[PDB]
Amino acid sequence: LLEGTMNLTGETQSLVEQLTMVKRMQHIPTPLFVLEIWKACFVGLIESPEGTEELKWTAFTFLKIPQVLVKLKKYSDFTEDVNCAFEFLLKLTPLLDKADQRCNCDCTNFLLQECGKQGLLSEASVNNLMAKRKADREHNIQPNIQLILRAEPTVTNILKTMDADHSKSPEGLLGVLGHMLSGKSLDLLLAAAAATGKLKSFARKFINLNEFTTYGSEESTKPASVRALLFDISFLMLCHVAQTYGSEVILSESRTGAEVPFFETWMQTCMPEEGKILNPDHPCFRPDSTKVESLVALLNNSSEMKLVQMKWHEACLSISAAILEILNAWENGVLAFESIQKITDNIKGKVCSLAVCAVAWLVAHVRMLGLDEREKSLQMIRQLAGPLFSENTLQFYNERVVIMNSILERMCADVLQQTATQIKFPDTMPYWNLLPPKRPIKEVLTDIFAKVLEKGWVDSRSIHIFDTLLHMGGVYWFCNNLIKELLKETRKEHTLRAVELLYSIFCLDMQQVTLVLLGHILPGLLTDSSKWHSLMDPPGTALAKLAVWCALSSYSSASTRQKKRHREDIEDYISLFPLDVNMRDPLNRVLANLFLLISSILGSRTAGPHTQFVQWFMEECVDCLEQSVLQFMPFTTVSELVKVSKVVLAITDLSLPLGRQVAAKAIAAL
Amino acid sequence: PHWLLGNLVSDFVDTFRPTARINSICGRCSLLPVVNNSGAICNSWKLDPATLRFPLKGLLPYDKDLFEPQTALLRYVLEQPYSRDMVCNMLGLNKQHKQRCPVLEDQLVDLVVYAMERSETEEKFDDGGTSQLLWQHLSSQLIFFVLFQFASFPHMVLSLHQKLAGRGLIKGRDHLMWVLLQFISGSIQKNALAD
Amino acid sequence: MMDLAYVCEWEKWSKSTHCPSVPLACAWSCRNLIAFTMDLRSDDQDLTRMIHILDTEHPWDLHSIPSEHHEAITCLEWDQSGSRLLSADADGQIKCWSMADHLANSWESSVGSLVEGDPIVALSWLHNGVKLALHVEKSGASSFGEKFSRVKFSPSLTLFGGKPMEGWIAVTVSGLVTVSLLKPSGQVLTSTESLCRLRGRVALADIAFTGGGNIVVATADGSSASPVQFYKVCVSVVSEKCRIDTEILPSLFMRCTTDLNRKDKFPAITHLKFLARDMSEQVLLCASSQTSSIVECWSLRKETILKWRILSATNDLDRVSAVALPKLPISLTNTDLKVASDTQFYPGLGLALAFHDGSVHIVHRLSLQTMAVFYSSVHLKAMQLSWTSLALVGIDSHGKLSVLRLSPSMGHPLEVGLALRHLLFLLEYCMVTGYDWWDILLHVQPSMVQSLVEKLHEEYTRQTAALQQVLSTRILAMKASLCKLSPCTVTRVCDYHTKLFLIAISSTLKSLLRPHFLNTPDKSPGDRLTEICTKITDVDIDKVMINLKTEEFVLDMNTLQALQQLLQWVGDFVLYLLASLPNLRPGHSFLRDGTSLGMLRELMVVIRIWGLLKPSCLPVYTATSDTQDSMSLLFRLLTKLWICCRDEGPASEPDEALVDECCLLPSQLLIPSLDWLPASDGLVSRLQPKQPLRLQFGRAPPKIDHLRRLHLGACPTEECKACTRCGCVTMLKSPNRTTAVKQWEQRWIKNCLCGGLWWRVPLSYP
Amino acid sequence: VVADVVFVIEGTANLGPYFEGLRKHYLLPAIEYFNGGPPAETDFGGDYGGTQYSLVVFNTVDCAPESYVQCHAPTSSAYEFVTWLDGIKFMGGGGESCSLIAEGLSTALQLFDDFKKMREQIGQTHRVCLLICNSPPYLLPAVESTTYSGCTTENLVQQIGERGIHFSIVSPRKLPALRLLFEKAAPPATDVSQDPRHMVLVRGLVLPVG
Ligand SMILES: [Zn+2]
């Protein structure tokens, strides 16, 4: 459910590695494992909000999850187990009926035919399962699943046909692209391409189309008025991709030569994202003084009448300075409001991407301003994002208006949250602004963790609030408060469930959470003499399990906020852990320090609950391992652990030639 | 448990989870009666007067909600008209003996602050709108429960002051003052003024 | 320049193992008390939750408040006075520690706020509207109104009068801000409110105040490519409750992100600091990579009307580990910059920047060019400049706590008159305020001491006759503490302290006599007594006592009996002085001071009257004869000494008749012994330039109560307070709560007479 | 009748031992006269019409970085005022005889200005100021006050005496400067001292004759 909610566009190999990890940590039978995959997928589909998220969830269950199962089959008698899991699932009639009411069709039929196509299931199994499902079921628009399952081959074939610009026929390109701009067709293609790993090539194709249509050639009005529309369609769909599926699918990741495209630089330096706030007087927003006067004269001329040669990248880069001079003119008073209306109509009318570039600079500039100084510039957005200017539209105007209104919603939303301002473009932002306005943020955390424990699984909305709290209060505060809420449980059942949930919650940034957990929380609980009454057997065994699962999963080795924040972070782990493979990698340093602490606790006097804790930690280090986290164990632990009470030697030693000597010493002298 | 026993006892009580799971009416927290004034109380709805918990047979590991004070049931019954004898049969009140039952007192206070909240929502779109009906029923119910000393006046007033402190609940304070006027006008001559 | 005054280390309690370090707090008060936390980490984590109070003159004695802070202490903050300490940790919980029984060794917090779960990231007391500016170009101007002048600042939240409320404002790691207002009663009002509607991370924050009573709080989320946002907060009290009104201000981005050559380095803003609280228009930021850093100064200045423009920035540094901003409120304008560059006055123009190597840079405020460099020969994890900014304290990446002295001209050699004028200017600033002057005595060389004392007396004169009233005991304390520092002048300090004690007795005895009826009105009976004793020069005590309306000098014979020990000190000091006359000793100054001998005469006369009322109040003298009137004998010799000095322009050397009569005094009476107050354990006399003292904490490299003159035993059973400056000892609780002269005991509840604080001394248990 | 009562007390070591006696003999009866009958726990603050009490406590210059005056907000409860009079701790003092009467009087003036902006339902009321001091004034002009800075005690007590504020002095030790200040605060156009030593001159208010 986490991989469905946060990164649909992630590669399947990382997910297969993580799932095989989880299957090895807690020893999970294969039918129950695949059953939990299907149950999670269907529950997340039912709980999805209506709109793009529902399309994305249908793609994840229908396309990505069947591919993941195929990779598991190669890595691992899988057909018998997946057939068993399908019978396990087909007992659950209320889940499947809720799903069928949301799917508007029987979605289990499409699942069984899809798993038949991938080869997870034999055909006789498929047919008797569909017979059972029809018997249990007995008691004009195509649904989205058929659209997606047929739209993935259109993704491949649209790649292969628009490699060549429809044999350089821009009228054909425009018609097919307008059909894509029609309702929901773009979203269907993007959801299929995201779930099937082909969003990067799709973005490369539209970016290359954009580079081709940037300059243009000697042309009369009719050919150019097609070329500017191609620029608009490619630009608006690229902005919609970058706002929905993240910006890192737009990046080229290696550009040999300086010829980075226009849209990549514009998105890099000029488009607001979630964690990106922009400098309005960055040198990117001040290209020249020469072209910008030509452009303000161009906007004050009339209907451009000169779209026959515009070099649209230069125009779009220059609009920021242009509207800056317009704003200074209006702040002095030398321009009337009625001429402002004329300039905004000349911007937003013929080409809609100009409005997006202007609104991006306006959002940066309004974010920097004070409270009382804002009032004029917001009116500019009200005219740039207003309803349609009419009677000179090129073609496909209403659909570009719809996509543009979505992009401007997601650009302006933060600034229009700072001051209570309604622009009212007409849900498209279903998980946005989730925290209560005044409540301290630990109450939010404890309430959501209480509800996740009492349900037994993590919702999609709960995943989004947990992400915002991890970004807001930081890793240490988050991990410490969740572990406190663990340690005040008193039942065996609730402690084991809380740990099995907290591992997945910590999979937001597993690596940093393990550094905080094994470096700050556990040494503070083991070293403080007042604290270790909290380390009693009911919560203590569960906590030791969570620490060893975190250590193993971090050793063997994910969201965009977490990528940005770890790139922000500076710390000296050599100075933090002085320590009396690389050993400049911080996780090796934390593990070596923790095992020194464990040996020191086992060797000392005053046995209490903390000694029981380090016993349990070493025992699940032994049991959870296949064979290595225990490569960092000091060899004095081999002697001491059976002083404090076989296999806990023979696994922990890692079997070097000197390691046999310590092994044979301990095992013979038990 | 003690740190030396530990798992040895805890897991043992966990193996008595299915037996407790057999002996639990499922959804018992969300089942509500229809309040009839007839008497002859079914003993399913009786609560514990000390702690508002359901009385449970045995010492098993019951489900986590059955150890919580059942305030939803008591608020639903107190919000109904003519639920006077049913609340006494629930909390074991007897009216031959005055007791100052505390959890009843706290539930009545929270009922008052809930009425104050719901009066402060609008109360002006619909003239009846269930608000003034609620305040009339609150007058009658709270008169009976403070009059026979099952709850007490000044602890109720100062706890009510602590709930309304800083919450900023001011649109229907006249109704709350009216209800307090019913108590004072009912029983000023019986008690000292320091109450 | 920089000299390490001392290095105080823990003994064997270092080597924190297996648990990583935490950031430290440090706070230097107006009185010289350091409050700081350290990472001790031995057998408990509460050893990282203890707040150490270190009086800067006796560092070995470190008090350790066991704060009940469940997470790590983020911020420490002294009052505008020095009397309370705010401490806030992660997960809310601001506690306000106050002194217990006015001891600087016992702290206890009764008042606090709590925003649970949210880590406090900035904390400040509210501003009380007092702000003064120092005009260095008027250093010679011979009036304190010209040198230090109040600058018309308004306090946030004035309540019914001119009186500011006291309270704090804290900023959490969420968007929340909270204000707590302490009433004059014990009540406390709290309110929390988000800073703006877009709730977001506040990883660094800072608080300044403005004229107009507006708080200005700056927030950053550490990313260094995101804006440093600014909010104006206005506090009000609506009828019972605090009310917070916030408003966005112009944010700023940061240079080195628009550098465009290599902009990706320095990705973390690590310190955000206004240049001083109440200086809300300038902001110091510090971006840092793993190895290098940049500090920058910005200013709000208007032209978009208001707009943050950069002032200056350093080139490239090491990674800045700590930052200390000055506290001396210089006047900062252009003429004062000129005269402080000409006459090399540099105390208020420096910030200190520690680095991740050993070095420390004292750098200019306005254009951040390095003024001095001190190489440690391990890094400073917390620094704090002093209130006169002559010394900076600092806690290292070990247990070590060091105090460095910064010279006022930053190592450039000055002629002696300029150094005299600088240190005299600072001592006058500490005299007008009540701040402590210990850091100044770090910089006073011995060879200048006497000249400096002369200048103080010349500046004690030529003020406007009310300043001379209010600066009396402050200048006696400063004179004594200066004269401690030189071997030529070390003899006089005892005199100064007895001078304080003499005045402290004299006025109080003249305070006790309530005239039962007003005869010869418009003169209080202190003045009638002084007039009568100065016009009647009779050598007999009876002839003076006759003419003094002795039905006026009446007490209730209970307090009159309880005054016995103070009257005993008066008689014994007179006898010691007169026997000391034939001989540099503890009494040498008093033999030629006519005024003090007049005071001793007046006290002997009122002692005679009180002895006739009740004979038990009198001092006792072991006389080597039984037909003797010892009081009349000492009064005869005192009048004959005092008539020497009460002449106009006299300096009469004492004649031989007095010399032989005072040679006969050990024959007639036994001269007892006396305790002299400054039992000197101060470091400033012990220190030398170029040599740092290496101390251990708690190692510390005829017992009387000096204020109520009670003899404790050999090893005293009752516990005691010691003054931190002079060193006088008093027992902690009064011996007889019924018979206690509260007019005398209640003067020294909060301080000593010299001015320093009390500090509880531990019992011996031999 | 409606009264704006302001007490100005010297919180120093002198007035330390004598305060308890002064309160029983003079201060407590004066409060009762304004509030008929002694107060006990039923009196509620917040009636902006009515008698309103206030404290101003001042100090000498030995509380060197601390503030000089501690003022309390107005209360309509006489009982809260009595608890405030108990709550004073007399800890100050040192080697001096004088105190900062100018500061206490200037903040009393600011209290009476805020009272005058408060009560507009009545134009003028009984505006009573008491000074419970044991010490002659300093020669400092007032420093820690706005709108009355740079004023000596004589100028401030002239401004108290004009505009119709009834100024009273209760002192446990008979003094010349206090008598001169009382004579100066003469409103535009009886032995109350129970103990002979006490000097009590009351321009306004009625205290049982002793
Ligand atoms: Zn002293």
Swiss-Prot record, chain A:
Q: Where is this motif: LXXLL motif 3?
A: 186-190
Q: Localized where?
A: Nucleus
Q: Which domain of life is it from?
A: Eukaryota
Q: Which GO terms describe its biological process?
A: positive regulation of DNA-templated transcription; positive regulation of transcription elongation by RNA polymerase II; positive regulation of transcription initiation by RNA polymerase II; RNA polymerase II preinitiation complex assembly; somatic stem cell population maintenance
Annotated motif LXXLL motif 4: location in the chain?
Answer: 295-299
What is stated as this protein's family in its record?
Belongs to the Mediator complex subunit 24 family.
- What interactions and quaternary structure are annotated? Component of the Mediator complex, which is composed of MED1, MED4, MED6, MED7, MED8, MED9, MED10, MED11, MED12, MED13, MED13L, MED14, MED15, MED16, MED17, MED18, MED19, MED20, MED21, MED22, MED23, MED24, MED25, MED26, MED27, MED29, MED30, MED31, CCNC, CDK8 and CDC2L6/CDK11. The MED12, MED13, CCNC and CDK8 subunits form a distinct module termed the CDK8 module. Mediator containing the CDK8 module is less active than Mediator lacking this module in supporting transcriptional activation.
Q: What is this protein called?
A: Mediator of RNA polymerase II transcription subunit 24
Q: Which organism is it from?
A: Homo sapiens
Curated annotation (Swiss-Prot), chain B:
Tell me where on the tree of life, at the top rank, the source sits.
Answer: Eukaryota
Q: Where in the cell is it found?
A: Nucleus
How the protein assembles, per its UniProt entry? Interacts with ELK1. Component of the Mediator complex, which is composed of MED1, MED4, MED6, MED7, MED8, MED9, MED10, MED11, MED12, MED13, MED13L, MED14, MED15, MED16, MED17, MED18, MED19, MED20, MED21, MED22, MED23, MED24, MED25, MED26, MED27, MED29, MED30, MED31, CCNC, CDK8 and CDC2L6/CDK11. The MED12, MED13, CCNC and CDK8 subunits form a distinct module termed the CDK8 module. Mediator containing the CDK8 module is less active than Mediator lacking this module in supporting transcriptional activation.
- Identify the disorder associated with this protein: Intellectual developmental disorder, autosomal recessive 18, with or without epilepsy: A disorder characterized by significantly below average general intellectual functioning associated with impairments in adaptive behavior and manifested during the developmental period.
Protein family membership: Belongs to the Mediator complex subunit 23 family.
Function summary: Required for transcriptional activation subsequent to the assembly of the pre-initiation complex. Component of the Mediator complex, a coactivator involved in the regulated transcription of nearly all RNA polymerase II-dependent genes. Mediator functions as a bridge to convey information from gene-specific regulatory proteins to the basal RNA polymerase II transcription machinery.
List the source organism: Homo sapiens
UniProtKB/Swiss-Prot annotation, chain C:
Q: Where in the cell is it found?
A: Nucleus
Mapped WD repeat ranges: 10-60, 61-108, 109-154, 155-192, 193-246, 247-303, 304-377, 378-409, 410-444
Q: What is one cellular component GO term in this UniProt entry?
A: nucleoplasm
Which InterPro entries does its entry note? MED16_bridge, Mediator_Med16, Mediator_Med16_C, Mediator_Med16_N, Quinoprot_gluc/sorb_DH_b-prop, WD40/YVTN_repeat-like_dom_sf, WD40_repeat_dom_sf, WD40_rpt
Keyword terms of this UniProt record: Activator, Nucleus, Repeat, Transcription, Transcription regulation, WD repeat
**Principal cellular location given in the protein's record:** nucleus
A biological process (GO) of this protein is: positive regulation of DNA-templated transcription
Task: Give the disulfide map.
Answer: none
GO molecular function terms listed in the Swiss-Prot or TrEMBL record = nuclear thyroid hormone receptor binding; nuclear vitamin D receptor binding; transcription coactivator activity
Q: Which family does it belong to?
A: Belongs to the Mediator complex subunit 16 family.
Query: What task does this protein carry out?
Result: Component of the Mediator complex, a coactivator involved in the regulated transcription of nearly all RNA polymerase II-dependent genes. Mediator functions as a bridge to convey information from gene-specific regulatory proteins to the basal RNA polymerase II transcription machinery. Mediator is recruited to promoters by direct interactions with regulatory proteins and serves as a scaffold for the assembly of a functional preinitiation complex with RNA polymerase II and the general transcription factors.
Q: What is this protein called?
A: Mediator of RNA polymerase II transcription subunit 16
Recorded source organism is Homo sapiens
Curated annotation (Swiss-Prot), chain D:
Q: Where in the cell is it found?
A: Nucleus
- Highest taxon listed in the record's lineage: Eukaryota
The UniProt-reported impact of R127W is:
Found in a patient with syndromic intellectual disability; uncertain significance
- Please give the tissue specificity annotation from the record for this chain: Ubiquitously expressed. Highest levels in brain, heart, kidney, peripheral leukocytes, placenta, skeletal muscle and spleen.
Q: Quick one: where's region Interaction with the Mediator complex?
A: 1-205
- Linked pathology: Charcot-Marie-Tooth disease, axonal, type 2B2: A recessive axonal form of Charcot-Marie-Tooth disease, a disorder of the peripheral nervous system, characterized by progressive weakness and atrophy, initially of the peroneal muscles and later of the distal muscles of the arms. Charcot-Marie-Tooth disease is classified in two main groups on the basis of electrophysiologic properties and histopathology: primary peripheral demyelinating neuropathies (designated CMT1 when they are dominantly inherited) and primary peripheral axonal neuropathies (CMT2). Basel-Vanagaite-Smirin-Yosef syndrome: An autosomal recessive syndrome characterized by eye, brain, cardiac and palatal abnormalities as well as growth retardation, microcephaly and severe intellectual disability.
Similarity remark:
Belongs to the Mediator complex subunit 25 family.
Q: What is this protein called?
A: Mediator of RNA polymerase II transcription subunit 25
Annotated source species:
Homo sapiens (Human)
Mapped onto the parent protein, the portion here is 14 to 231 of 747
